[PDB]
Amino acid sequence: SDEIVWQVINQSFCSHRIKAPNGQNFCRNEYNVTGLCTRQSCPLANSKYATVKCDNGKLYLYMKTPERAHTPAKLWERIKLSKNYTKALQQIDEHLLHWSKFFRHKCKQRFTKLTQVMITERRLALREEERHYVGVAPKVKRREQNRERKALVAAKIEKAIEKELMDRLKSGA
């Protein structure tokens, strides 16, 4: 059951847990509202769950119920979130009617964060950044450094300048 699953994932090596240096157990599972592998937050430890995920620009409210635990292929249902923020919040609240306040609050927070993540569009609209990040390999760096020095040594710029000046002022004054 949930208690057995919860305790096994907690104390028996949950596969998707991440241990931060601060001492917080994270959760990289895609179906979790919060990235922390605590109780009532990990989707595997709770039969009833709700989360917000997106594949295209549209945002979807993902939730699961014990009606589909026996059939993982149809475990999670989704509904278009009505990406109008004011309408979306009320739609989420209505869909999560009678659900735990924790789930409703976490779903609303996740939806708001995903909506405000649209800053990517703002940066995309404000494109034409000319810095053009470029990676330099150690092998490439070695070529320029040594070969540039060899070219400088072989060039003998002073002698060429002297020869050009002598040839120029011979009949240039």
Binding site: P21, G35, Q109, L114, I119, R123, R131, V134, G135, A137
Partner: protein, 123 residues
């Protein structure tokens, strides 16, 4: 956030770590009874003890106020979406520059602070 009061900023050093080259700087408690350091006589190097414990509310927080979190790929980076203010994405030293640009792009898209940006990159 609460002020980050560092009880002991100076790095602790083993006794005689500089007098002899065969003694590593890593701290090691003196075991001899006659050792002055063990008796913490006045003027000796400070001995680490429970007193220097940092407070929980500011423990592990960098001066910028964001906790460090090692990130290996985009999947790890996406986990900090709900903790951008409290956590910051740190790229591992073994990440090739090829994936570093992609990781930085995703961090900027999600607004996750990067502790060591531009590493191995050139503009």
């Amino acid at each position: 956030h609460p002020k980050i009061v560092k009880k002991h900023t100076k790095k602790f050093k083993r006794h005689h770590s500089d007098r002899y080259h065969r003694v590593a700087e890593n701290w090691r408690k003196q075991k001899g009874i006659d050792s002055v350091v063990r008796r913490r006589f006045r003027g000796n190097i400070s001995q680490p003890k429970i007193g220097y414990g940092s407070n929980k509310k500011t423990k592990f927080l960098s001066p910028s106020g964001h906790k460090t979190f090692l990130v290996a790929n985009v999947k790890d980076l996406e986990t900090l979406t709900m903790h951008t203010k409290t956590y910051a994405a740190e790229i591992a030293h073994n990440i090739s520059a090829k994936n570093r640009v992609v990781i930085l792009a995703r961090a900027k898209a999600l607004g996750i602070k990067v502790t060591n940006p531009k590493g191995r990159l050139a503009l």
